[PDB]
Structures are given as C-alpha cells and as structure tokens.
C-alpha cells in the first residue's frame, strides 16, 4: 500500500494518536495544533 499524504491549510481529516491537553494562555508554552507545532504565547484573538 502506498499512503499519499497532504498537509494543507484545511481541516484535519486523519490524525495521529496523541492525547490532547487543556489550553494554556498568556504563558510561553510549546504547542501542537493538528501537528502544527512551535513555541509562543497563546491568546484570544480578534482574527476572523
């Protein structure tokens, strides 16, 4: 079997088994959203 992936800016359709944790805001944290992972401060936003 050949699995072909794509990692677009589009809703996640298949995910790895990772457990998921509560949001932490206004603190510098590591984060991982749908495999998009980095480090920074998370806050609410005015963005649409």
């Amino acid at each position: 079997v050949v699995l072909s992936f794509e990692l677009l800016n589009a809703p996640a359709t298949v995910c790895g088994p990772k457990l998921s944790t509560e949001l932490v805001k206004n603190q510098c944290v590591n984060f991982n959203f749908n495999g998009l992972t980095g480090t920074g401060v998370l806050t609410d936003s005015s963005k649409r």
């Binding site: 794509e6 677009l8 800016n9 589009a10």
Partner: protein
Amino acid sequence: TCGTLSNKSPPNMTQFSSSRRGVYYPDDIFRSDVLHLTQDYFLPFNSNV
C-alpha cells in the same frame, strides 16, 4: 440505445479572444494580502479561443 443525427454540419471553428478570461487558483496554498508570481499552465490573456 442512442439518439441519432443527420444533416449535422461540420464545426465552423470560428475564433474569439480570451480577454483576461479564465484565471484560476494554481495551487492549494492559502495566501492573503500578497502578490504571488508563479509559473504554471494558464490560459494566456488574449489567447485564441
């Protein structure tokens, strides 16, 4: 079962211009508030049609 035709004239092939007509999004990457210069299969402007 198929319908049938006769006295069907040959196509005439008269030609027109795609005046800026037919642009499309070349890839799935989301972009916003930017200018993107790209090489792809596009219908050229003022192409024969």
